[PDB]
Design a binder for this molecule. Structure first.
Ligand SMILES: CN(C(=O)CCN1Cc2cc(C(=O)c3ccccc3)ccc2N=C1N)C1CCCCC1
Length: 388
């Protein structure tokens, strides 16, 4: 179907997924992180201890200067840049060349990650959350208007399998970003769609949460406290303070046969099990019910411990499989990160203002269980879950 784009993503979920791209004339190649969490196409345009390479504007005959600066701070950090434009392409993507807005990053604190292997970020969200403002057209918006590529893209993040490293990056590809299409070889079963509440972040509405079938039983509005978005840039599944606690307890209980340190459930410290003996069956499956496109109808996606327990290279890299509990609390609402996406083929159907989920043909699981997507359900009381 889209053989060309299949498996065009790499990196490390923990350090983000990225795709190859080229900017300027002649072509300058750079790894760009795929982030559904933002709307700026920003690349390193100056040396930095963590950049193997960067965008060299003086060497591009098509580069154009907008003579406008941009300051973006975030978490005790920030990236500063100079706005401009140039021609862009995606080798393992559509065979097209567009002209996009490019923030040439010139100074940054806490942005570029050591080891990730990407020198830039491709924000696929809407302009509403673009810096310095919504007038700076996002990349995909430009791509869709300068070509005939369909206004939609889908993602299948396969998180590989076992612990990887900066070296294992260019050895085992991570996943796929299919631009302008939906690839039938990336999923099994049906594709279920949930509406996009507001086009700024990819915001959705969750109506119910379950732990091994048991209802978390909270006012559905609490689940979307502030907001709920899907973000390929975020590693963990992030949930409000309350929901978070309620969940850890339920998860704690479910797994009682064995006890772990409070440090584990805080993401502070990890756990290990003699190679090959990880007791998956002891940990519970998790499920989020989403609002359906059809009124009063809803469906659910379900992940396994193989999705929320991230494999990490042991401290002493011994012969023991250790794991990190990838479920943490949030204050900015729910973030459906990689622990969620690595279970499904996710479709960002902007043209129809919806997002679809399907079982990933590459998700991790043992023969006893499997991730799922099932519907329809009728648990009256849904739009009422939307926060304001
Ligand atoms: C925190 N990260 C996330 O992916 C979670 C949600 N975000 C935040 C985010 C922040 C930025 C920045 O402007 C920035 C500035 C200085 C230092 C760090 C970040 C840009 C895009 C963002 N998109 C998200 N998905 C980080 C995960 C690694 C990639 C950077 C964002």
């Amino acid at each position: 179907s889209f053989v060309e784009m299949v498996d065009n993503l790499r990196g490390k979920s923990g350090q983000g997924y990225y795709v190859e791209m080229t900017v300027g004339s002649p072509p300058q190649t750079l790894n760009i992180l795929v982030d559904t969490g933002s709307s700026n196409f920003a690349v390193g345009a100056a040396p930095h201890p963590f950049l193997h390479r960067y965008y060299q504007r003086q060497l591009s005959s098509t580069y154009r200067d907008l003579r406008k600066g941009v300051y973006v701070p975030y978490t005790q950090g920030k990236w500063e840049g100079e706005l401009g434009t140039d021609l862009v392409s995606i080798p393992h993507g559509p065979q097209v060349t567009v002209r996009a807005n490019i923030a040439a990053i010139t100074e940054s604190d806490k942005f570029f990650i050591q080891g990730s292997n990407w020198e830039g970020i491709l924000g696929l969200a809407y302009a509403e959350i673009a810096r310095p403002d919504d007038s700076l057209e996002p990349f995909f918006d430009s791509l869709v208007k300068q070509t005939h590529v369909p206004n939609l893209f889908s993602l299948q993040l396969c998180g590989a399998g076992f612990p990887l490293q900066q070296s294992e990056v260019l050895a085992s590809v991570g996943g796929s970003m299919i631009i302008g299409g939906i690839d039938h070889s990336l999923y099994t079963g049906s594709l279920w769609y949930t509406p996009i509440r507001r086009e700024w972040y990819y915001e959705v509405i969750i109506v119910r949460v379950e732990i091994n079938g048991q209802d978390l039983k909270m006012d559905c509005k609490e689940y979307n406290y502030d907001k709920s978005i899907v973000d390929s840039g975020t590693t963990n599944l992030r949930l409000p303070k309350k929901v978070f606690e309620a969940a850890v307890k339920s998860i704690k209980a479910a797994s009682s046969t064995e006890k772990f340190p409070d440090g584990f459930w805080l993401g502070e410290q990890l756990v290990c099990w003699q190679a090959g003996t990880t007791p998956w069956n002891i940990f519970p499956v998790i499920s989020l019910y989403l609002m359906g496109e059809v009124t009063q109808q809803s469906f659910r996606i379900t992940i396994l411990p193989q999705q929320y327990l991230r494999p990490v290279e042991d401290v002493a890299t011994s012969q023991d499989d250790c794991y990190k509990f990838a479920i943490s609390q949030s204050s900015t609402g729910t973030v459906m990160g990689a622990v969620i996406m690595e279970g499904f083929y996710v479709v960002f159907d902007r043209a129809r203002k919806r997002i679809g989920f399907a079982v990933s043909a590459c998700h991790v699981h043992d023969e006893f269980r499997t991730a799922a997507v099932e519907g329809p359900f009728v648990t009256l009381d849904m739009e009422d879950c939307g926060y304001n």
